[PDB]
From Swiss-Prot, chain A:
GO terms for molecular function: propionyl-CoA carboxylase activity; transferase activity. InterPro entries: AccD/PCCB, AcCoA_carboxyl_beta, ClpP/crotonase-like_dom_sf, COA_CT_C, COA_CT_N. Disulfide bonds: none annotated. Pfam families: Carboxyl_trans. It comes from Mycobacterium tuberculosis (strain CDC 1551 / Oshkosh). The gene is accD6. This is Biotin-dependent acetyl-/propionyl-coenzyme A carboxylase beta6 subunit.
Swiss-Prot record, chain B:
The biotin-dependent acyl-CoA carboxylase complex is composed of AccA3, which contains the biotin carboxylase (BC) and biotin carboxyl carrier protein (BCCP) domains, and AccD6, which contains the carboxyl transferase (CT) domain. The keyword Cell division does not apply. It comes from the Bacteria. This is Biotin-dependent acetyl-/propionyl-coenzyme A carboxylase beta6 subunit. It holds the Pfam family Carboxyl_trans. PROSITE patterns: COA_CT_CTER (PS50989), COA_CT_NTER (PS50980). Its EC number is 2.1.3.15, 2.1.3.-. GO terms for molecular function: propionyl-CoA carboxylase activity; transferase activity. Belongs to the AccD/PCCB family. Residues 1-210 form the CoA carboxyltransferase N-terminal domain. GO terms for cellular component: acetyl-CoA carboxylase complex. The gene is accD6. One of its GO terms (biological process) is fatty acid biosynthetic process. InterPro entries: AccD/PCCB (IPR051047), AcCoA_carboxyl_beta (IPR034733), ClpP/crotonase-like_dom_sf (IPR029045), COA_CT_C (IPR011763), COA_CT_N (IPR011762).
Amino acid sequence: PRDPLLRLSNFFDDGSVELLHERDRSGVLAAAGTVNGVRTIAFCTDGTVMGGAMGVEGCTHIVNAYDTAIEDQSPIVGIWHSGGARLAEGVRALHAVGQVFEAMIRASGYIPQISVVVGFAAGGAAYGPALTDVVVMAPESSGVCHIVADDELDAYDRGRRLVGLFCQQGHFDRSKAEAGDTDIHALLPESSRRAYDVRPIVTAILDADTPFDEFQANWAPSMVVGLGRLSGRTVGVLANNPLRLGGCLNSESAEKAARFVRLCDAFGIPLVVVVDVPGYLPGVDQEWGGVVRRGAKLLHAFGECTVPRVTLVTRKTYGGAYIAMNSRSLNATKVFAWPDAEVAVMGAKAAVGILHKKKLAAAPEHEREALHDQLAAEHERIAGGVDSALDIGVVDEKIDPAHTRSKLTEALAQAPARR
Amino acid sequence: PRDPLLRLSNFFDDGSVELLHERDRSGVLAAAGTVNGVRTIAFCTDGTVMGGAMGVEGCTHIVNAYDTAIEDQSPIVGIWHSGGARLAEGVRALHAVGQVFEAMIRASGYIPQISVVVGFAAGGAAYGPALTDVVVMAPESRVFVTGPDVVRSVTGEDVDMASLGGPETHHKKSGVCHIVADDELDAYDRGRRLVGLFCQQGHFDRSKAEAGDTDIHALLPESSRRAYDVRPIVTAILDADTPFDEFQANWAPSMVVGLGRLSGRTVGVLANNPLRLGGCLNSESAEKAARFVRLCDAFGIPLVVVVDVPGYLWGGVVRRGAKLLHAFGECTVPRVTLVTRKTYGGAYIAMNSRSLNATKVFAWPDAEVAVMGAKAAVGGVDSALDIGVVDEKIDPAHTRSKLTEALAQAPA
């Protein structure tokens, strides 16, 4: 039921399991197999022996599995179900667990590491998955966990799909991009003032027949990140979500976006950045909790990034959030805008209030409103994205939204694999 | 007084200032000079022009200075005093500010970047210091993304500038400020010392290490139950003649980190501090340590890790604890660990353990390395030597020279 061989067999392609060592009561079993054709290493802790508690010989098989995966550059998948370290083994067990961590650290950014957590998971079984790239959790067991599966079988499914996304990247296909084009703009609400869930726009850009594997959907909900396929090719998507916190960036969403960029960058996965963000969320909590540093992590992640990364401005992009959301100044591949997009320091009404403050305060009370409006409409006419933005080359092209999918695909495909 | 030439001259060795461009009204003045002999680039935003608001021309001086500094491998010091980007310049100024960030990101880990905040660093200017390696704040300085104005208008909360983004709040609550200066001049002094720590790293000297040996163990309390400030232990190991430049003292204070000198050589120190939360690791102390390890690792600065924690105190701590593990595990600078009283459990693994490749692990005679305390377990250094996880049991009277020798012996 919790039998490590059953669990490994459910994970791996049907005929494919080869054990990496003799079965024993060490509390782990490691095997090679294939995942939809890809040689993959996996290990399962043994829920049947001491609740899966981790000891010296078990950790050794994990470290051995990592050495093999690293040597053959295969992805490596951990299946968890463990309540902590074998206490009776004392410091030897701590050391052996530290050795699993060191192997994960050696693997980091080099081979994909996916954790599928299927039982109660504590100690080494909490930190170990936290050193991996993706964590899939099954009900029987922030932003630590990326994907919540429906049940144990569905977790293997999502785990399997993740191997395919990292290891079977695929190729951009101009034909498939175009045949999947639609007027994505029709997905926005009628008023520019209404909030909306960005997720349908994401899934309308990405291939119709493919799941979008959103990461950490309930952590930092003003930011949506995850992996999917664009004309068959694995891409990472980052999109502000106006439904939550007005779509604003904040400490959590900056950290979520920044980790996800680093991940895609490490594995050569191009990025689609869907922007509609009015700024960072003001707040005492934000300043005091170090948003400045967090925001700096997102600037740094995009600025260092070398995979192709294309921005699509759907509605707004303002201020420091505009800079952070894969702007040209950060060395962005291409920046596209829908026809009614705006790129500005802030909204025209707020801008006018500052720029013409004294003149507004000098008008009588009863004319102040009409004047404020006239000034804001003029300020719109002057700049009002994306006109000024096009003129200085920080937006490359204003596009027909019907061609969003193909335009994005074309820009990512034309890009070098590594800037 | 906010004159940028005055500020740059106060920072640089006397008579060393060589302007990098003709002085103008762009809001920035950049120059080369020396800091105790070391060729250094600096730029100062010009608070006398539009409160130092950042614009295309001024940002361009900054990017140019970064380019010079990168080319020459010179440290680069920014002196702040800026309200944000020039609103009237629109998206042009946002772009130019993003270009400053992109230059700091290019420089990142390659040349030392030190920010000395002397007035505001607000709006887009607050992120500038955040991208650099060490932030020094003077008493008058204020760092925040959105001012009390917009805070009160959007959230209803009413806080003043000092309370929102003063050096006291950023040294304590947020960890944004590494170092707080006594005044404007002392902030330059500290930044000058930081240039020295990064760029005149020195060498280990066995003779000097041994001359400074004292009985460090005598500084611990009689009772091993008793809490005690680790900072005297740290300063007893480090050279008695040199400041210990502690980072983020008031933030996550169960972890102490900072830069000092060991027989002349710049070292980073990480030390659990039993004075706060029993010396336990937790989310923010794991983050503080991890950031500091990565910084020292980037600049070739060896580490002294002084260990006396009993465990950790879940999402934040699992994520940050992983960061720590990862930081030490990837670290390539020599780093030695000293176990003074206790190390338990997962905290033991994280605090530069042998499994994460510590250069060498020392322990005092009475240290304990265990899964948990004896009384918890029911419900020893000899053994840790046997197992291989401690390399040497030392006489605490030789703490300083034994640590120095192990660091000096690592090929680097």
